[PDB]
Tab-separated table of C-alpha atoms in Angstrom:
chain	number	residue	atom	x	y	z
A	1	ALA	CA	0.320	0.368	0.515
A	2	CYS	CA	1.053	3.245	0.398
A	3	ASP	CA	2.639	4.757	-3.447
A	4	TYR	CA	3.587	7.976	-1.713
A	5	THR	CA	5.913	7.683	-0.056
A	6	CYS	CA	7.868	11.069	0.624
A	7	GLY	CA	10.138	12.195	3.212
A	8	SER	CA	10.762	8.976	4.411
A	9	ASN	CA	6.693	8.821	5.034
A	10	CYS	CA	4.790	5.942	2.813
A	11	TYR	CA	1.679	7.688	3.079
A	12	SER	CA	-1.989	5.985	1.704
A	13	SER	CA	-2.738	6.521	-1.761
A	14	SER	CA	-6.668	5.894	-0.850
A	15	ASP	CA	-6.363	7.839	2.185
A	16	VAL	CA	-5.129	11.078	0.076
A	17	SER	CA	-8.414	11.297	-2.381
A	18	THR	CA	-10.248	11.423	1.366
A	19	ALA	CA	-7.667	14.837	2.088
A	20	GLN	CA	-7.925	15.250	-1.729
A	21	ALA	CA	-11.588	15.565	-0.832
A	22	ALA	CA	-10.736	18.230	1.465
A	23	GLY	CA	-8.974	20.632	-0.584
A	24	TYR	CA	-11.909	20.742	-3.574
A	25	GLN	CA	-14.661	20.428	-1.105
A	26	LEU	CA	-13.961	24.389	0.032
A	27	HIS	CA	-12.405	25.289	-3.542
A	28	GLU	CA	-16.373	23.917	-4.990
A	29	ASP	CA	-17.391	25.168	-1.659
A	30	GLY	CA	-16.986	28.793	-2.595
A	31	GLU	CA	-14.846	29.146	1.020
A	32	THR	CA	-11.842	28.828	2.362
A	33	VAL	CA	-8.917	28.007	4.753
A	34	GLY	CA	-6.560	29.591	7.840
A	35	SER	CA	-6.990	32.836	5.182
A	36	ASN	CA	-4.802	33.017	1.811
A	37	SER	CA	-6.815	30.173	-0.082
A	38	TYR	CA	-5.011	27.273	0.073
A	39	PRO	CA	-7.583	25.788	-2.227
A	40	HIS	CA	-5.966	27.097	-5.640
A	41	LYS	CA	-5.358	26.009	-9.724
A	42	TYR	CA	-1.694	24.581	-10.395
A	43	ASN	CA	-0.519	25.639	-13.941
A	44	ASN	CA	1.685	23.113	-14.251
A	45	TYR	CA	5.033	23.235	-16.176
A	46	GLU	CA	8.407	21.620	-14.252
A	47	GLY	CA	7.470	18.637	-16.927
A	48	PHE	CA	4.666	16.223	-15.231
A	49	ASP	CA	2.502	13.406	-17.126
A	50	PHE	CA	-0.600	13.304	-15.390
A	51	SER	CA	-4.033	12.440	-17.228
A	52	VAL	CA	-5.759	14.229	-15.405
A	53	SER	CA	-7.403	17.709	-16.849
A	54	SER	CA	-5.832	21.166	-17.208
A	55	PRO	CA	-7.134	22.885	-14.421
A	56	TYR	CA	-6.101	21.620	-12.140
A	57	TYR	CA	-5.622	23.349	-7.934
A	58	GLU	CA	-3.256	22.425	-4.712
A	59	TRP	CA	-4.120	21.381	-1.385
A	60	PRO	CA	-2.002	19.547	1.250
A	61	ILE	CA	-2.196	16.330	2.512
A	62	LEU	CA	-1.605	14.743	5.905
A	63	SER	CA	-1.797	11.789	7.855
A	64	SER	CA	-1.912	11.935	10.926
A	65	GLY	CA	-3.059	15.951	12.081
A	66	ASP	CA	-6.335	16.384	9.954
A	67	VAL	CA	-7.040	18.861	7.020
A	68	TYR	CA	-4.764	21.748	6.912
A	69	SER	CA	-6.490	24.125	9.505
A	70	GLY	CA	-3.810	26.067	12.169
A	71	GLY	CA	-0.285	25.066	11.363
A	72	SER	CA	1.851	24.894	7.957
A	73	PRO	CA	2.045	21.941	5.677
A	74	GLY	CA	3.759	22.604	2.352
A	75	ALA	CA	6.669	20.089	0.794
A	76	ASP	CA	3.507	16.696	-0.035
A	77	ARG	CA	0.784	17.898	-1.793
A	78	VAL	CA	-1.570	16.038	-3.996
A	79	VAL	CA	-3.128	17.501	-6.958
A	80	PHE	CA	-6.344	17.480	-8.408
A	81	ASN	CA	-9.581	19.502	-10.420
A	82	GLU	CA	-12.871	19.663	-9.973
A	83	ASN	CA	-13.720	15.998	-9.441
A	84	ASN	CA	-11.003	14.763	-6.730
A	85	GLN	CA	-10.524	12.133	-9.525
A	86	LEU	CA	-5.755	12.761	-8.608
A	87	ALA	CA	-2.939	14.775	-10.881
A	88	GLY	CA	-0.513	13.498	-8.879
A	89	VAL	CA	1.437	13.655	-5.553
A	90	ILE	CA	4.428	16.900	-5.933
A	91	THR	CA	5.777	17.743	-2.931
A	92	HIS	CA	7.082	21.809	-1.948
A	93	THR	CA	10.477	21.768	-0.929
A	94	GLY	CA	12.449	19.145	-2.667
A	95	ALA	CA	13.292	21.851	-5.883
A	96	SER	CA	14.235	24.618	-6.108
A	97	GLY	CA	11.742	27.712	-4.849
A	98	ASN	CA	9.925	24.226	-3.664
A	99	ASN	CA	8.725	23.661	-6.710
A	100	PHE	CA	6.141	20.697	-7.058
A	101	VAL	CA	7.626	17.268	-8.534
A	102	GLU	CA	5.737	13.610	-8.973
A	103	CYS	CA	7.351	12.607	-5.120
A	104	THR	CA	10.576	9.498	-5.825
């Protein structure tokens, strides 16, 4: 199981989906979290090979705390579009300017 082990953290790809509907439910609800709109749309440029849609989105995924709301996730950050599908787990720290990149 856990196919997204980043920073030495075998995250469950099935658990990432739940957190995937976390930043999504908010993006579609129009509401927001913390106070800076965490769930936003990612344009992508590095060089991925996702196969979902164009209008991606970013939101932090956790496996112990809970929905991002009172702390600082950063680094891991599964992407998505508007159906809680899954663009891929990208990291925001393993690349200059914590750019995003498939967890490898």
